[PDB]
Design a protein around this motif. Structure first.
Motif, PDB file in Angstrom:
ATOM      1  N   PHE A  15     -49.001 -97.568  30.650  1.00 46.17           N
ATOM      2  CA  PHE A  15     -48.268 -96.396  31.083  1.00 46.17           C
ATOM      3  C   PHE A  15     -47.934 -96.531  32.561  1.00 46.17           C
ATOM      4  O   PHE A  15     -48.181 -97.567  33.184  1.00 46.17           O
ATOM      5  N   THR A  17     -44.952 -91.580  34.023  1.00 50.26           N
ATOM      6  CA  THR A  17     -44.698 -91.472  32.592  1.00 50.26           C
ATOM      7  C   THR A  17     -45.712 -90.594  31.879  1.00 50.26           C
ATOM      8  O   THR A  17     -45.365 -89.933  30.894  1.00 50.26           O
ATOM      9  N   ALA A  41     -45.718 -90.647  26.687  1.00 51.41           N
ATOM     10  CA  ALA A  41     -45.246 -91.789  27.456  1.00 51.41           C
ATOM     11  C   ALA A  41     -45.107 -93.012  26.559  1.00 51.41           C
ATOM     12  O   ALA A  41     -45.728 -93.109  25.499  1.00 51.41           O
TER      13      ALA A  41
END
Length: 460
Positions: free
Chosen positions: A237, A241, A247
């Protein structure tokens, strides 16, 4: 004139004027140490209130010093103050005993202790964003099936719980997102639900893409996010995000199998190599970098002490690896891919069954912190010779031991243990313990040498 000054005076001296024991010296020592802890605020108080310095000291109800005056807790000597301020002279220790209490390096090192609610068990504990005001320790819960995150203060030490999920949170992560200056804390419990909480915004509770199998370890090393699923798939990730819901897994490092859970995701300690990251899945260890692919895949398989599931991998010039319920740590080479040496805990702790290596926190260049299965912590000078001091008798079983930078006196060890009716205490050691245990040791021998030198001059 042996009655002494009235402010600094034993009650057996004042009340009735009985014959003076040698323990009145210990009582005056306790009062002097109370001034030392309080910077003599009671003395300058009694300079304006002599009845407070002398007549109010007729009882051993001298107050909580941290409550009355702003000072560090320093609690192992606060128990000593409570001991040598006893009204009974027989209950107060001898001066040799109070010198041997003052000879402990744990006394000068330990900053504070804290007790928790009755039988709360915490599996994951993380530090806050290292801001000066935002200094606290998050705690999950394992005492019940339903997982609960607990915000816990350090400046005021106030327990604040909050329900989290139906399964106990095995592991937790957090990141001070520099985008919008948000303190993002992500909670992936054992049930796979990847919840989040802004530390500032307690209403900021969202779920990401749900982790498929059991979440085992997260990590927050641009700046990415690292999660170790039970299938090993490292879903990458980013700090911006995770802010949204769901995400994208910008990489799936599906390394092991579902039977091989990713137990650790560490980070390097040098720079020109550009900090190749690490990890341990199942038993075999591996690595990755900003590319997020297996750089090296070093194989690492008694039998259950040699071949088990991994617990942690720490990154240094070597690699130190613990297993589940194994009393040895396995020194591995990142280049040679071989067992360079072994350090068995029972080769040290038996020199003072239970006790196997649980946590492995690593000091920068001098110490190595070992968390035993029992109430012991072992400090290794990793370069030259191993054993320095086994600290014990302060907890029952070290659960999670990790350093942090909190409360403006950075580099403190948040050693967490139990007390079995299981009180889960949290101690905050200074990280300078390995230097203190030898500095005090050399200094004591120096003073003993000077004392023995000038004692011989008395009979000369």
């Amino acid at each position: 004139t042996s009655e002494g000054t009235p402010g600094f005076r034993a009650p057996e001296v004042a009340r009735g004027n009985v014959i003076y024991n040698q323990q009145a010296d210990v009582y005056s020592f306790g009062l002097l140490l109370y001034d030392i802890l309080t910077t003599g605020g009671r003395i300058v108080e009694g300079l304006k209130f002599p009845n407070e310095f002398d007549e109010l000291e007729i009882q051993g109800k001298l107050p909580d010093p941290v409550k009355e005056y702003g000072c560090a807790p320093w609690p192992m000597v606060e128990k000593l103050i409570k001991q040598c301020l006893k009204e009974n002279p027989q209950e107060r220790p001898t001066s040799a005993q109070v010198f041997d209490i003052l000879n402990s390096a744990e006394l000068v090192c330990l900053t504070r202790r804290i007790l928790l609610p009755k039988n709360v068990i915490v599996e994951c504990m993380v530090a806050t964003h290292h801001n000066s005001r935002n200094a606290s320790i998050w705690l999950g819960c394992g005492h019940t099936d339903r997982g609960q995150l607990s915000f816990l203060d350090l400046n005021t030490e106030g327990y604040t719980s909050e329900e989290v999920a139906d399964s106990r949170i095995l592991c937790l992560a957090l990141v001070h997102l520099p985008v919008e200056k948000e303190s993002w804390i992500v909670s992936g419990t054992q049930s796979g639900t990847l919840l989040v909480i802004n530390t500032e915004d307690g209403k900021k509770r969202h779920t990401l893409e749900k982790m498929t199998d059991s979440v085992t370890c997260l990590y927050c090393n641009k700046n990415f996010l690292l999660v170790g699923t039970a299938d090993g798939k490292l879903a990458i990730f980013e700090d911006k995000t995770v802010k949204l819901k769901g995400a994208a897994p910008l990489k799936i490092l599906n390394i092991g199998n579902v039977s091989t859970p990713l137990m650790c995701l560490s980070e390097s300690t040098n720079s020109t190599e550009r900090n190749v990251m690490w990890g341990g899945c199942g038993t075999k260890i591996f690595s990755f970098s900003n590319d997020f692919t297996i750089q090296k895949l070093i194989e690492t398989r008694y039998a259950a002490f040699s071949d088990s599931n991994i617990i942690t991998v720490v990154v240094d010039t070597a690699l130190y690896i613990a297993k589940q319920n194994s009393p040895v740590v396995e020194v591995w080479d990142k280049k040679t891919e071989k067992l360079c040496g072994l350090i068995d805990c029972v080769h040290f702790l038996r020199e003072v069954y239970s006790g196997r290596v649980k946590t492995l926190c690593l000091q920068k260049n001098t110490a190595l912190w070992i968390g035993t299965g029992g109430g012991h912590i072992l400090l290794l000078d990793l370069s030259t010779r191993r054993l320095i001091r086994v600290i014990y008798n302060f907890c029952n079983s070290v659960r999670v031991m990790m350093t942090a930078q909190l409360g403006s006196l950075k580099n403190v060890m948040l050693v967490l243990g139990y007390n079995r009716e299981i009180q889960s205490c949290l101690t905050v050691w200074d990280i300078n313990l390995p230097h203190e245990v030898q500095n005090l040791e050399k200094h004591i021998e120096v003073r003993k040498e000077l004392a023995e030198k000038m004692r011989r001059t008395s009979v000369e």
